[PDB]
């Protein structure tokens, strides 16, 4: 019933930890596995297209990246559901990393050379827009939209964009702070990222940490450690509760661009996100 | 009476919490709401124009950026106003967070490609010299007006500046520090950022926060997290006190500039801002 | 001459605040006023004239930043300089400021803009080097010269050089560590910031904290808020003591460049820096001769 | 027997300091040592070789920088291995530092020169993409495979690639993160950087920590101190500890690269590392 | 005898001041001190000469920027050296600043203009490779020889070298960490910091901190105030000892390089330090 937190639960399995690793959702989905189909393309968004006037501006949904989320299951707590204190899976810290930033040092591929004029040099690697957030909490990842354009013409299918949720076409205020244009974080791969917003007048039951680099050429820049706890309590030193007893966790990590030789296509380039959970019963009314 | 701090109250609603969003000012107003019409600009400024001589500066306006502020009530406390001790809302923090940052990750748009040359590549993200300023007082923030040149012409209707208050053109002064030329920011989107700044010999009831970052192409950067609390508290750990029982909130976050496929157009990108204050009651004499 | 530091002075006004403000000094004097006359460019250096050769530099002094500095007067403590104890002030920290950084987003104006070809897009916003420090100090900041170059021809009079000070030219020392090289900044607008450095040798009744970003282009940054304290108590707990009665200000704070469309002469801006120092009566032991 | 931590050991001997330094592994082997027959390229790789079709991707093994690792020997602690309580050595922490940043100083060489037009100006120093991670643990170090292209043909010798584990072809989902591809780093210079990373879902007996700055000119960035202090105890107050008696010493410290004045060839530059661990005797179960 | 560390002593004069200042060795010697006969290079290098080939790099002696040391004699101790327990002195702290970074603001001189297409603009101010090293200890600064390239031919005379201290050629393994290539840091302007470097497996009377940031065109940054005390004391509380009662000072502090209006030639700007030591009787065994 009411969320009043009372002292935390000792004994046996009182406190437990969860892994799980979300890969990134840049564009290209995990199928077709094949090398020579697109799957060659998996951890990758598709070439990205340019509108083709101010007033026609259409993606594809697989040049678009969207948000890496999973709910995971908790160990049952409660017997009788009908008693006056019972007990909530507090998560209190969690482990984080983005894994793979090696990879980058492959400036061996065929993108577009250093050289342009002799087509020598090293394949450029990737560089750019860098966009890194993550998310614990016990309830799906509120979202506040906001676009650069709200005359993009996003597709009716395959994705969640405001219209999908309004139900209506986007207004001018959705350039802005418009709190008609909410959602939820409840599906893997689906709400754009350059649409869908952490909400800071939510997610009272959410800890979110997120950062954004700009540029077309900007310097990649990642840290990675074992060593390192992010505390998910909050100033009164209660973590995030599961009421459903459903744990959430939601991510993005964008780090930049590479492009093709043709045309100067670029592709959008995520890396995978490992979470390490530690969680603990707390007594609540 | 006399502006002496004494203990906090104790006992029910002696704390409260308030919420607010500030939408950016950055030229162009909410309405006309048509998408066709001007809306398409909404969050942005109109194309920035460039002065025709050394002695013709006269920008638009709508080309630029204004403070962005709101006067917050709060609930009623003093019933016997000829008490010889009375209560003032305090302000203790605030969680304030810049939301929008991943919409600069649309880069699909109509704006001046990275490969000029075929018309290729991506559209150039939102790239320049960012400006963010927060504060919340118990009065408007009290500011100090300071201009590049003192004969640039702005418009005398639509914008509050330095002559609108001193009804005099601006001195050569007013490129360096004038203490005549003063204001209060009692207006959203009418004092133009490039005149008017954080007053530092005044502001005794309000915390300000500002940085700046110029450039023609710098990359934007921004954090966000719902994990950072903003102390308020001064040195004697006594905050801003409302003493007209009006909580003031002012903001800019200027993220830079995109610019057009025709004579490199700009247009200022601005991003709304959260505020969520959380006061206490305080005994004054 | 002995420093010997007691107890806090407490009772009645045994604490005090001081305000002020220092304008920036980086070559155009606050007068003449006009608009037309040279007044537009108060704020700002003149244009930056270049050396003509590898023997002849020649600056003007319109062209280079000097030093900004204040002596502001605290109310006068002991009636009888022979007392055994005697009271002084002490500086505790300060709260200081460099104001006007968002004039900086006006690129609207007649610089050099970032469309060559169509002489479009913006008005290039002030970029480059950029150096800012301040200091306060019971005594005249000690300055140590160094310049980049010992045979710049700098004017004679107008501007404080060595050679003000030495009456002698600058010898090839001077463009590293020349113990001789020193003087002390006791007037505002007269010391350039290329040739007149802190004295870390010496300052012992001031503290000075300075910063540089060197380039051409380099993005301009600052941060303001009045919520930041600078503590200048020493190691000791003893912060900077008036023994003349005297608070010195001194600050540069150098933004960068605008440049015009005409053989891209550089302006040098600067801004101006706010000072709220918070000062306490200290007992002493006698140091007066 | 179980693995139980108590108290720490004391008396004669009781703590201990170990000291090493692992040579970077860029591409050129140690050997041969002649400065006429490839010798003149060791602590860099040889020129990196780019792919000749989106297709035909198969980078040279002395162009490919591969982790430096050591096994070094602990003074035995156990005389009566049936014995219920044992003594362990435990990692503390360690001083580490990569030596020789001061020779990228050297701009009198045969490089591309800074001025192209006229052959000019000084030798370009070493500069882009920079990668340093260092390890230490009482195991070899957990790897996870990731890779920027999945059909990317590695020599099948000479180094250790996802295929040398699975024995079968990398799949998409190695380009995220696939479970399946991992390994150990059991050999020095022989595992690629730009393969293998540390696996966050492992190393629970060592620590790492990474960091990464990519980019093609990017200004190399190094500190270095006899001052710093890296603990290596855990959150409980204990440190890695050495199961087999033996410690675990890994790194990679790339720099950037050099680049010829013959068709822009580029060298990965490598620094060595130096380790100083101080370890003490743990009582287990 | 046995250099255990026992109880600071106390006492009149017990603790002291030292200040020096150490000017920088670039290249250029301070003589002759004439301003048309070389003179007026002090402060700087020559003109930064260029490898002919490959196999051809021969820098001349003024181009390369040497380490600055200093020997200052502190007062004696004891009388009878044949006592149980002796005094020593140790370094307790140090207030170091590099002044002079304000003279890098000339931009009216006669370096590579801004403008090079018209010959306009200001005259370009020293950028590119930084390196800020200083040391304090009871014994010369130990010395790890690396470098670049082992086929340099560095001068024979003027200059102490690799082959200065082992009497035969580099071998490649100089280009990485050759245990072989040590020396001391005993000589002001002699030692080329792109050979020698601060050796972590020794210096344990010295306390070094270093920093290195590449690049041809990087901004110099620095900070300087009168404010900031450096610690030498390590974790155990003591600072280094001076064993022979000869305080050694050390440091390189290069700022970056100018270039001239012909060829684009480079000369190396390094500024000094000073240095302000605390020190304080120690009781030794």
Known sequence: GGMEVLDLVTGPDSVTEIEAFLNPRMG?????????????????????????????????????????????????????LTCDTLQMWEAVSVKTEVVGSGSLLDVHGFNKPTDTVNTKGISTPVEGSQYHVFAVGGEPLDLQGLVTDARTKYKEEGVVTIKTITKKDMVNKDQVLNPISKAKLDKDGMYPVEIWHPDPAKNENTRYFGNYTGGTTTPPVLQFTNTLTTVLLDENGVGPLCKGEGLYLSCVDIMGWRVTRNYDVHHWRGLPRYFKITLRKRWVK
Request: charged share 15%; no cysteine; aromatic share 8%.
């Open 28 to 80: 290209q989905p995990p199928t077709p596995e094949s090398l020579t189909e697109g799957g060659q393309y998996y951890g990758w968004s598709r070439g990205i297209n340019l509108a083709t006037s101010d007033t026609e501006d259409s993606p594809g949904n697989n040049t678009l990246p969207t948000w890496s989320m999973a709910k995971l299951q908790l160990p049952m707590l409660n017997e009788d």
